[PDB]
Enzyme design. Structure first.
Site: not given
Ligand SMILES: O=c1ccn(-c2cccc(OC(F)(F)F)c2)nc1-c1ccnn1-c1ccccc1
Ligand SMILES: [Mg+2]
Ligand SMILES: [Zn+2]
Length: 313
Positions: A68, A72
């Protein structure tokens, strides 16, 4: 006015593509951004001296966390740039201005922790903002930097336009709260399929900008496989650090965040592509057909992860 930014031939060409990677040279990212702002909005829309000062202040206020971070920030801005350049006539002058800025600032001051961790830790920001805690903090940081001296890149906007554009930025940044994505896409789907989606309805544009922001935010899953694969290390590095802090508060963390459950990452990614990413870019393609490359690229990666599970890598 006559000082057009230019890029090396490969970057000049490869930056117009959705799957562009901004590379390992931090020092070029500000120029990459200005280039995009010019091509996407106009040479005129921002005062170069002010813009650069703003860019550098925003950079200084991202932190050295695995994912982050400033990279990014610019990556997300680029995805938006691509979307705007492939949907030339759909968007207003202020929208093209605010959105690129919104993306640059969207994770300002992020420490690598989810909203949930702040709640359970009882962080003071959680007191101040019960929902979308970091996102209201990111917007608030954007407003700080905007009010530093010599930093008002919107200074030629009227009182009205200024308020409009800051409201674009606010809504846009809030929408990067993924908890809000699920409903937002549900509604856009039903609106699109039942034929009632209507881009003169401001209430509808807001929703559509929200989805673009989710798309841009998640866009590392829409890169060529080795970029996607390598970014994943970074995302999970924050996750496991949070898990650690959860365990420190006396709370077994979800396996996504437990670094003892590294072996479940591939199945975890599958889940996320199916439950989150694929739906996002499907619906976004339905609303904005030219963004199809993001869907294609996302599917390609979903297939690549399936191949990991089958031991083919
Ligand atoms: O690879 C990943 C695997 C899991 N999650 C993720 C994030 C948050 C909640 C979640 O589970 C839910 F709540 F949706 F079910 C799953 N995000 C990614 C990812 C890929 C790209 N960006 N990004 C991301 C990273 C951090 C935050 C927001 C997006
Ligand atoms: Mg954010
Ligand atoms: Zn972001």
């Amino acid at each position: 006015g006559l000082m057009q930014f230019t890029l090396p031939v490969r970057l000049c060409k490869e930056i117009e593509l959705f799957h562009f990677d901004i590379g390992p040279f931090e020092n070029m990212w500000p120029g990459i951004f200005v280039y995009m702002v010019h091509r996407s909005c106009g040479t005129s829309c921002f005062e170069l001296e002010k813009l650069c000062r703003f860019i550098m202040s925003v950079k200084k206020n991202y932190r050295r966390v695995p994912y982050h971070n400033w990279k990014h920030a610019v990556t997300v801005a680029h995805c938006m740039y691509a979307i705007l350049q492939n949907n030339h006539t759909l968007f207003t002058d202020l929208e093209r201005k605010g959105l690129l800025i919104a993306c640059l600032c969207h994770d300002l001051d992020h420490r690598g922790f989810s909203n949930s961790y702040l709640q359970k830790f009882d962080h003071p920001l959680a007191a101040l903002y019960s929902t979308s805690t970091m996102e209201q903090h990111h917007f608030s940081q954007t407003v700080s930097i905007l009010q530093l001296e010599g930093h008002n890149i919107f200074s030629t906007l009227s009182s009205s336009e200024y308020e409009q554009v800051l409201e674009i930025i606010r809504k846009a940044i809030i929408a990067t709260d993924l908890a809000l994505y699920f409903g937002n896409r549900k509604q856009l789907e039903e609106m699109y399929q039942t034929g009632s989606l209507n881009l003169n309805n401001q209430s509808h544009r807001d929703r559509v900008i929200g989805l673009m922001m989710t798309a841009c935010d998640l866009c590392s899953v829409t890169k060529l496989w080795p970029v996607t694969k390598l970014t994943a290390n970074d995302i999970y590095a924050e996750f496991w650090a949070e898990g650690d802090e959860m365990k420190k508060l006396g709370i077994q963390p979800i396996p996504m965040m437990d670094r003892d459950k590294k072996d479940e990452v591939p199945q975890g990614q599958l889940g996320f592509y199916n439950a989150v990413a694929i739906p996002c870019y499907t619906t976004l393609t339905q609303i904005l057909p030219p963004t199809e490359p993001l869907l294609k690229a996302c599917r390609d990666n979903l297939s690549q992860w399936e191949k990991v599970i089958r031991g083919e890598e």
